[PDB]
Amino acid sequence: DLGLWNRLEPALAYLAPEERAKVREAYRFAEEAHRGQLRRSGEPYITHPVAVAEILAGLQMDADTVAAGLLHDTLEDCGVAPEELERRFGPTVRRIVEGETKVSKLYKLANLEGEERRAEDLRQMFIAMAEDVRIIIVKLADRLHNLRTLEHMPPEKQKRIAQETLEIYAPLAHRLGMGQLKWELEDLSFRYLHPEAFASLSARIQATQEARERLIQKAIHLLQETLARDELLQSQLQGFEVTGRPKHLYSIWKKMEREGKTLEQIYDLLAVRVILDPKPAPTRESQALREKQVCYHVLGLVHALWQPIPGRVKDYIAVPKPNGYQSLHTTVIALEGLPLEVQIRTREMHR
């Protein structure tokens, strides 16, 4: 057995049972449609829309979006008409899979090459044609998985796709507030577009990586304990996760070229992330309050645990960034005299 559903299924627990039922129906429909089809990796095609759905489930997208992630390829390859996807999964799931597949072609057609701000007018083209932003998110999840599996492609295609992601899709994830997605698109694009510079920067970081993650883990273990042993915070919380922030390799090398610095000359600010999953609240309004309330509760315990550097609290929950970015940030003195940046946000805020 393929066993792809058994990997996706756990990621779907945030959906109501009726919604997970729509996603199982979508999985089987995709399973049937792509039967016998193969990816250039030698893996059966279904591996891709399952990976794409899995990315959207990680991002906690609505049921129609994740089901559309499984069906996002069925129309072109498999003798499936859009009428079938609307008849079987409703018009929003069709709308989205039709939109993700249709835009792929528009970018092929569009004449903007070597043009002053060509990516700006091409990014706006998708923005203008796709009023339901879910279409863009599915396209971003698709491009991410394609990049994740870019080794099974000619090196010519590898750089064409990496550059296109760097001009179009990574900036589109920025506009949409999907920074988690944006970072990964950037680093994966950087890997294939400039391989020589990626392999050199990665090697330098892999020398101090033994000590850096050793320190970051002391702070993670300590902050995990502190949060878990706080009875009131846990009373309003379903779950939580404390992680180390990954080095944004593309941005690190980008600032080295611009500021004319070396990887030794640039300051490695250690950062940790607290992701909070609040417990289901009896009303929609009470759920919204809990979301805010739980991040400020954490800010306080972080300040009880580590001494806060003055003027480093940043409240993007009260005042989100222009792309709708919401998180709380505080720079503290942790690790015996070291600056540690703490990012605090909910599961819903983590995009």
- Does 35 bind Cl ion (CB under 5 A)? Our answer is no
d(CA 318, CA 84): 44
Instruction: For 55-90, give the DSSP string.
Output: HHHHTT--HHHHHHHHHTTHHHHSS--HHHHHHHHH
The catalytically annotated residue of 62, 76, 151, 213 is: 76
**168: DSSP letter:** I
3-state secondary structure of 38: strand
d(CA 329, CA 317): 10
- Does 149 bind ligand VE8 (CB under 6 A)? Our answer is yes
Strands 338-346 and 270-278: parallel
Is 100 a residue of the active site?
A: no
Query: What does 316 bind: Cl ion, ligand VE8, Mn ion, none (CB cut-off 5 to 8 Å by kind)?
Result: none
The single residue among 31, 54, 64, 142 that binds ligand VE8, judged by CB under 6 A, is: 142
Q: Which is nearer to Cl ion, 158 or 302 (CB)?
A: 302
The catalytically annotated residue of 32, 43, 62, 77 is: 77
Instruction: Please give the angle made by the CA atoms of 305, 209 and 351, to the nearest 5 degrees.
Output: 65
The single residue among 275, 276, 334, 349 that binds Cl ion, judged by CB under 5 A, is: 334
Q: Which is nearer to ligand VE8, 22 or 48 (CB)?
A: 48
- Does 155 bind ligand VE8 (CB under 6 A)? Our answer is no
End-to-end CA distance of the chain: 33
d(CA 187, CA 72): 25
- Does 153 bind ligand VE8 (CB under 6 A)? Our answer is yes
- Does 100 bind ligand VE8 (CB under 6 A)? Our answer is no
Query: What does 334 bind: ligand VE8, Mn ion, Cl ion, none (CB cut-off 5 to 8 Å by kind)?
Result: Cl ion
**347: DSSP letter:** T
Query: What does 39 bind: Mn ion, ligand VE8, Cl ion, none (CB cut-off 5 to 8 Å by kind)?
Result: ligand VE8
d(CA 346, CA 327): 8
Query: What does 104 bind: Cl ion, Mn ion, ligand VE8, none (CB cut-off 5 to 8 Å by kind)?
Result: ligand VE8
Is 76 a residue of the active site?
A: yes
Stretch that binds Cl ion, among 41-49, 78-86, 169-177, 227-235 (CB under 5 A): 169-177
- Does 146 bind ligand VE8 (CB under 6 A)? Our answer is yes
**289: DSSP letter:** H
d(CA 24, CA 53): 11
Least distance between Cl ion and beta carbon 189 (Å): 16
Q: Which residue has the tokens 């597949």?
A: 101
Interacting residues toward Cl ion by CB under 5 A: 28, 123, 175, 179, 325, 334
Enumerate the active-site residues.
Answer: 76-77
Interacting residues toward ligand VE8 by CB under 6 A: 39-41, 104, 142, 146, 149-150, 152-153
